[PDB]
Amino acid sequence: MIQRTPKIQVYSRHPAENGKSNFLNCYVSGFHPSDIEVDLLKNGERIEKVEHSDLSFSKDWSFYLLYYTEFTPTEKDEYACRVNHVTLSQPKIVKWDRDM
Amino acid sequence: QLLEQSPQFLSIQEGENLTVYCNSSSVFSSLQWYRQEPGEGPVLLVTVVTGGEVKKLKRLTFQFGDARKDSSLHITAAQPGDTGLYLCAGAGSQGNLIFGKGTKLSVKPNIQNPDPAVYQLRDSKSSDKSVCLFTDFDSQTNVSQSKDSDVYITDKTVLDMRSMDFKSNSAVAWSNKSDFACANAFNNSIIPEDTFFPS
Amino acid sequence: GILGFVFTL
Amino acid sequence: GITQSPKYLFRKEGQNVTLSCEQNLNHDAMYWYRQDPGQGLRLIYYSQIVNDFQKGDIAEGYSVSREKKESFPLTVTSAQKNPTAFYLCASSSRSSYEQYFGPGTRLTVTEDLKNVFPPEVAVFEPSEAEISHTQKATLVCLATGFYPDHVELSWWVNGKEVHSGVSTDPQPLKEQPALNDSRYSLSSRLRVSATFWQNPRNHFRCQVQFYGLSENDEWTQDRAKPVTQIVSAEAWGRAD
Amino acid sequence: GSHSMRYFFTSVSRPGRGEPRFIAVGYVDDTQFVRFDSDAASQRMEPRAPWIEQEGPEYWDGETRKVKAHSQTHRVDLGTLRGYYNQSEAGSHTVQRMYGCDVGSDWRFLRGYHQYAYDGKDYIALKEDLRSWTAADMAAQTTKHKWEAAHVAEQLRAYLEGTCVEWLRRYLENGKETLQRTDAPKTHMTHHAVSDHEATLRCWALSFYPAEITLTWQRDGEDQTQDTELVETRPAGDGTFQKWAAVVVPSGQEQRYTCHVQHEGLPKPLTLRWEP
């Protein structure tokens, strides 16, 4: 029985342009077990239409998933990803930075 | 995947050696041979896995081709007990066994002192009413079907009397007719010229 | 295409 | 090993029947085949693991389930004009590996129960000619007019079943090759030394165990209901 | 170049909440093409790439039948392993399995794989010779002995060296436009002051395929593995990948730094510099 904590990256599919449709992604990887909670937030509120990739894993058996939603960024709106996993002492919030 | 068995039928005299073949264009990871008697479950004889391996189980010798696309079963000094349907089967890619269609082997007894005769046996419980018994003919003789649909004739079978170290072939014929007599009972078959016909 | 035969550990 | 009870099964057309197959070999994979006279095996259905099954080459009209590792029941529904056959179940530790076969079950499905008939059995005594010519005596047993072709013939000498000097026909004869429900005949021979047959104390009996109707089958015909039963014929030695 | 086909299976028990959840996914190189999820309504192996949808009904019926058999086998395996490890029936456990093949540039067999993990740790694996097993402990030794007695490896070897490779070649052909293509990285650099004496230069590689790529920062001479942050390659969500590398440099020394990008889609490695 081994547990591995998820690595988290929040980013857009294409370079962000205010007022232009895009996709907001939260990529979680390197975790074990596979049960994981991932949500995308807009100004702190959970975005309802969020999909994710099919469960897969790496050479070391750790899992990875991509969560995503279509979105139109602006100058004022803030986006973030909330992740919870058994390995975490408390949920993690990672804010979207358009240049990361 | 396919497995082809040859020959389809083989009839040989007791004491002879024989070979049956199982061939394919594809490679099998494991292969089995079975012997089945009528109305009974096939009996597993062997499993081979290594290309080129040879397995000898008593008088039976099994070989798996180096390329694992073929196998053979060879029997030394065939005994009447070897009679049966021989099936080869190979590991199937979809989780089953691929079966050949089999080789039906018939081992005929060596009748040393043939004494072909046709006897009339009477019912133990009824006057008249009887059966004709064609017996003690050599294995070279074959019993044919009957002409009239009302005349019943069985195929030949072998009987062994171990006590007397004696073996004999026989066939039976009976009919509901009236003109039917053991004299013309087996007229549709090639019976020995010197067949004893009790007067 | 996946394996056509399965086997337990 | 593998059990397939019962050895003989008889049903009226239109009556679904489930054939049992149980194995105590701790095998994961199970298989069902049917075999016609003088032919090879045809795969009906198989299961590589408990809770999964898949069709063989001739699955139409059949159905299976695999809720337990030890059992694989085969249901024969209104398949078609051909449910009558020899059914064999087999298992292997893992699928694709060597299979071990059960003993088989002979299923006969008839159009009408009135086609069922028990065998009439007769024993024919050795002829004097054979005795003087060969010093041997051949007794012949004839089981005739039975349907289905589900019988087991045995010879008994002085109260003991014997497996010496006996030769029973491998297959019966259809008294009417035309009819699909034709009745059958079967013959067997018991050959003994003339000396043994010449002892008036010796008793010979040909026994034919027939498998037919059960109590679940209704019977309105005047003749005795053709239920599973034993029919025998006997003879006694004769001093010369 | 070389190619691979891989199938990944995950079975997770959930005592008191029904049967284990089973998920299967298949990939050719870095492209997913099929999936199965035991909890989904379809109960069929489903397409996840346009090019596999051209396969006829018999292909789909077959993959669905086979994947359902895999699902039940790994469900039994969860029970077996709980027993081998004397674990309670209350906890959730995971069985993972992966198998597949690699082919070289000539599309000929290069390597085969078939291995398992229990609760995220190696359990048993078929060695590269495709004839022997690597068992992690006594439990795995029991599995090894069972599989040797029933000659599992010989049958798997035939699939990995033959069938597997044949499917890979077929898919590489049917999905040729998408699988045999390379998408060179689209690149750009950003600059941000992180203080009154330092700045951050970030080198971006976007929309590339396959995933393999090398991004390096050099200063006048070569490689700068100092104060250089490199993120893990990540999926864009449209079948392509992304990666970036950043360096913190003294303000006024931007001219000394260059970002180098190596990718199979590039005829020659790219060298990028900060240009305000």
Q: What is the full DSSP assignment across E18-42?
A: SSPEEEEEEEETTEEEEEEETTSSS
Q: Helix, strand, coil shares of chain B as percentages rounded to 5?
A: 5, 45, 50
CA distance D56 to D97: 16
Its CATH class, for the domain covering E182-270, is: mainly beta
Residue E29, both tokens:
């190189």
CA distance B190 to B171: 13
- Residue of B119, B128, B156 to mutate, interface with D, max D Cβ within 10 Å: B119
Start-to-end Cα distance in chain A: 34
Q: Which residues of C touch B93 (CB under 8 A)?
A: 4-5
Ramachandran quadrant class, B187 (left: phi over 0; alpha: psi -120 to 50; beta: rest): alpha
Residue D99, both tokens:
């299979």
Residue B54, both tokens:
């040879």
CA distance C8 to E81: 11
Q: Looking at the DSSP assignment, which residues form a beta bridge with residue D87?
A: D34, D105
Residue type, E155: Q
Topology at the third CATH level for domain D112-240: Immunoglobulin-like (2.60.40)
Residue whose tokens read 């100092």? E226
Residue of E nearest to A1 (CA): E119
SS3 string, D11-34, reads: EECCCCEEECCEECCCCCEEEEEE
Q: Which residues of D98-120 are buried (b: 16+ CB within 10 A; e: fewer)?
A: bbbbbebbbbbbbeebebbbbbe
CA-nearest of A1, D27, C9 to E139 is C9
Q: Measured at the alpha carbon of residue E182, what is the angle toward residues E177 and E187, in degrees to the nearest 5?
A: 135
Residue type, D80: Q
Topology at the third CATH level for domain E1-181: 3.30.500
- Is some CB atom of chain E closer than 8 A to the CB atom of D68? no
D 39-98: CB under 8 A from B:
40-41, 43, 46, 48, 54, 56, 86, 88, 90, 92, 95-98
Per the CATH hierarchy, to which homologous superfamily does domain A1-100 belong?
A: Immunoglobulins (2.60.40.10)
Which CATH number among 2.60.40.10, 3.40.50.970, 1.10.287.1080, 1.10.3720.10 corresponds to the domain B110-199? Answer: 2.60.40.10
Strand bridging mode D151-157 / D120-124: unpaired
CA distance D52 to B94: 13
Q: C5, D49: Cβ pair inside 8 Å?
A: no
Residue of E nearest to C1 (CA): E167
As to burial, measured by CB atoms within 10 angstroms (0-12 exposed, 13-18 middle, 19+ buried), residue B41 is buried
Strand bridging mode D136-146 / D120-124: antiparallel
Say if CB E246 and CB E229 are below 8 A apart.
Answer: yes
CA distance E248 to E15: 51
Residue type, E233: T
Q: Measured at the alpha carbon of residue E34, what is the angle toward residues E31 and E35, in degrees to the nearest 5?
A: 120
**DSSP character at residue E212:** -
CB atoms within 10 A of CB D33: 27
- In this complex, which of E25, E238, E242 lies closest to A56 when CB atoms are compared? E25
Those residues whose C-beta lies under 8 Å from the C-beta of residue D122, and which sit 6 or more positions away, are B123, B124, B125, B126, B129, D141, D142, D144, D233
C-alpha to C-alpha distances, A40 to A44, A73, B114, D198, E257, nearest whole angstrom:
9, 13, 97, 103, 36
Say if CB E80 and CB E13 are below 8 A apart.
Answer: no
Start-to-end Cα distance in chain C: 22
How is chain B split into domains, by residue range?
Answer: 1-109, 110-199
Q: Which residues of E touch D52 (CB under 8 A)?
A: 68-69, 72
Angle between helix E138-149 and E57-84 (nearest 10): 130
Say if CB A37 and CB A23 are below 8 A apart.
Answer: no
Instruction: Tell me the backbone φ, ψ of residue E238, rounded to 5 degrees.
Output: -115, 15
CA distance D94 to B30: 13
Residues counted in chain A: 100
Q: Where are the alpha helices (DSSP H) in D67-208?
A: 128-134, 194-197
Say if CB E126 and CB E151 are below 8 A apart.
Answer: no
Say if CB D2 and CB D90 are below 8 A apart.
Answer: yes
| CATH architecture entry for D1-111 | Sandwich (2.60)
CA distance B46 to B56: 10
- Is some CB atom of chain E closer than 8 A to the CB atom of D49? yes
Q: B94, C6: Cβ pair inside 8 Å?
A: no
- Residue of D99, D162, D204 to mutate, interface with B, max B Cβ within 10 Å: D99
- Residue of E152, E154, E161 to mutate, interface with B, max B Cβ within 10 Å: E154
CA E54 to chain B, closest CA, distance in angstroms equals 23
**DSSP character at residue E71:** H
How is chain D split into domains, by residue range?
Answer: 1-111, 112-240
Do D1-111 and D112-240 fold alike per CATH? Answer: yes
Residue whose tokens read 């190596």? E262
Peptide bond into E57 cis (omega under 30): no
CB atoms within 10 A of CB B130: 20
Those residues whose C-beta lies under 8 Å from the C-beta of residue B199, and which sit 6 or more positions away, are none
Residue E106, both tokens:
């000539």
B 44-73: CB under 8 A from E:
49
CA-nearest of B123, B179, B129 to B150 is B179
Helices and strands counted in chain A (H then E): 0, 9
| CATH architecture entry for B1-109 | Sandwich (2.60)
CA distance D19 to D9: 9
SS3 at position B159: strand
DSSP string, E213-237: -EEEEEESSSB--SSEEEPPPEE-S
Say if CB D190 and CB D204 are below 8 A apart.
Answer: yes
Final resolution, Å = 1.4
CA distance B175 to D191: 23
Instruction: Tell me the backbone φ, ψ of residue E67, rounded to 5 degrees.
Output: -70, -30
Say if CB D123 and CB D139 are below 8 A apart.
Answer: yes
Ramachandran quadrant class, D14 (left: phi over 0; alpha: psi -120 to 50; beta: rest): left
Q: Determined by which method?
A: X-ray
CA-nearest of E118, E72, E119, E91 to E16 is E91
* Chain E residues whose C-beta sits inside 8 Å of any chain C C-beta: 7, 24, 26, 59, 62-63, 66-67, 69-70, 72-73, 76-77, 80-81, 95, 99, 116, 123-124, 143, 146-147, 150, 152, 155-156, 159, 163, 167
How is chain E split into domains, by residue range?
Answer: 1-181, 182-270
Q: Where are the alpha helices (DSSP H) in chain E?
A: 57-84, 138-149, 152-158, 164-174, 176-179
Say if CB A23 and CB E237 are below 8 A apart.
Answer: yes
Q: Which residues of D touch C6 (CB under 8 A)?
A: 48-49, 95
Q: D46, B95: Cβ pair inside 8 Å?
A: yes
Q: B41, D96: Cβ pair inside 8 Å?
A: no
Residue whose tokens read 């259809």? D174
CA distance E163 to B86: 30
C-alpha to C-alpha distances, D6 to B111, B185, E174, E202, nearest whole angstrom:
40, 40, 53, 79
